[PDB]
Amino acid sequence: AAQTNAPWGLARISSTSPGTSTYYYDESAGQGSCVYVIDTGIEASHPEFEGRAQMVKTYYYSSRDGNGHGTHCAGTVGSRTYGVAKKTQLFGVKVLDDNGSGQYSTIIAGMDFVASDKNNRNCPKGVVASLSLGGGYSSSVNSAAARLQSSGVMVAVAAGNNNADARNYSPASEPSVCTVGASDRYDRRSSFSNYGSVLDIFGPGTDILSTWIGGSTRSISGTSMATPHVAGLAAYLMTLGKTTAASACRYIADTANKGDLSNIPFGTVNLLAYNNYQA
Ligand SMILES: NC[C@H]1CC[C@H](C(=O)O)CC1
């Protein structure tokens, strides 16, 4: 399948070269998989989600996304126009309030929730979790991310936006999950992207167009935007049967475009997520 005039990041995911604008992908499009977006919520009524999004948990007085960030991330995973995996099921877990803030205790509870709740959901092709959040190092936060991964969920986490080594951030620094840095449309490391040996992969993160609250769209930047590209890619590849939740981060790294990014510090992987689709 081909989506013309796609956002640059989707085109980049499906290309061996920068500078193209069509997204190419197998039409299965993640059908039968499910992706949990653990964030500020998802505006499930947005036309871009086509009924495939649903809030399943909140830790606040409402399940509504009053911020926009969670809706944007969910759109990059799975919206019809802005999403990698256009037929996946999206499940919202609101661990961040409408100012984008949340306690680590709440974030941990949300991760434990997904590890159990997946067993109440029909996801025959596999389960992914996208965590576009983090803060300073916490052993408890890393352990919760490691538990979620071990339960059979492909966990993708943002490296962080401090232009610093991600070893000092959580859940970015947990070795067993998939830690995602950000690149721009000229194949440069994004100016804010964290780096370091803990990173597993880069995805598009600068100037990413996706869904927003109020039935709208906008472009924003962050490792928070690169993470759902990788999460959606994992759901897409799992639906194709190419990999599993336990192996998808390694598979994405094995099949990535290698050596194409600039301003990668010595010691950080030079790997850009790629779907390897040939029509
Ligand atoms: N691993 C639990 C979750 C993944 C798929 C499973 C199934 O589809 O049989 C039930 C929900």
Side-chain angles (χ1 to χ4, degrees), residues 32 34 115-127 151-153:
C34 67
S116 177
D117 184 74
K118 64 141 159 40
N119 313 314
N120 285 300
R121 308 294 171 185
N122 286 300
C123 311
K125 302 302 208 193
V127 184
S151 82
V153 174

Side-chain angles (χ1 to χ4, degrees), residues 35-39 73 77 128-132 154-157 227-228 231:
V35 185
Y36 285 81
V37 181
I38 306 175
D39 208 285
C73 293
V77 175
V128 181
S130 196
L131 281 143
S132 295
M154 193 285 179
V155 183
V157 310
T227 301

Side-chain angles (χ1 to χ4, degrees), residues 37 39-46 48-49 53 55 63-79 82 90 92 209-218 220 225 228:
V37 181
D39 208 285
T40 66
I42 305 172
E43 181 170 288
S45 67
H46 199 301
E48 278 282 316
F49 295 125
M55 284 312 288
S63 58
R64 168 179 161 260
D65 182 10
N67 180 280
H69 186 268
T71 293
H72 194 276
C73 293
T76 296
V77 175
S79 67
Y82 312 99
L90 298 161
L209 180 59
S210 187
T211 42
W212 201 253
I213 53 172
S216 188
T217 59
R218 67 178 60 183
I220 58 172
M225 279 64 255

Side-chain angles (χ1 to χ4, degrees), residues 3-24 81-84 204 229 257 272-275:
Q3 179 192 352
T4 195
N5 198 33
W8 80 262
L10 303 187
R12 190 65 190 90
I13 287 282
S14 61
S15 189
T16 54
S17 286
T20 71
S21 54
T22 305
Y23 175 38
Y24 304 107
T81 304
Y82 312 99
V84 173
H229 280 91
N257 283 310
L272 181 63
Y274 176 49
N275 73 358

